[PDB]
């Protein structure tokens, strides 16, 4: 109920194209591969077959539920801009769920 731990995860792969832009988003699947220690880029790219890797790593995020979701978004962004990509993800996610 609640949808779970459905909250970043589903953000993150709606507005893929906002992110994967954003620098290098890559980022993501490491820290995911690091903490699951399979959802790697050979995982990945099996799956990237279809729906394109920015929506592979939702998948890795939505297995996790917790680590993946909170480690890729943070680690991703630490590239990108904590500052700016993190405090502005609040509105993002929040929006973005649509319900």
């Known amino acids: 109920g609640a949808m779970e731990s459905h909250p970043h995860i589903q953000l993150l792969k ?17 820290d995911n591969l690091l903490k699951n220690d399979y959802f790697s880029a050979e995982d990945a790219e ?13 998948k890795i995020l939505d ?11 943070f680690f991703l ?7 700016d990509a993190y405090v502005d993800l609040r509105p993002w996610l929040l929006e973005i769920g649509f319900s």
Not at 63 to 73: D, F, I, W
Not at 77 to 83: E, I, K, M, T
Request: proline residues 4%; hydrophobic residues 35%.
């Open 77 to 83: 962004y630490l590239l990108q801009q904590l500052a």
């Open 63 to 73: 297995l996790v539920q917790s680590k993946g979701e909170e480690v890729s978004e």
């Open 14 to 30: 709606s507005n893929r194209e906002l992110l994967v832009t954003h620098i290098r988003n890559t980022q993501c699947l490491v």
């Open 46 to 58: 099996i799956v990237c077959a279809c729906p394109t890797q920015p929506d592979k790593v939702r």
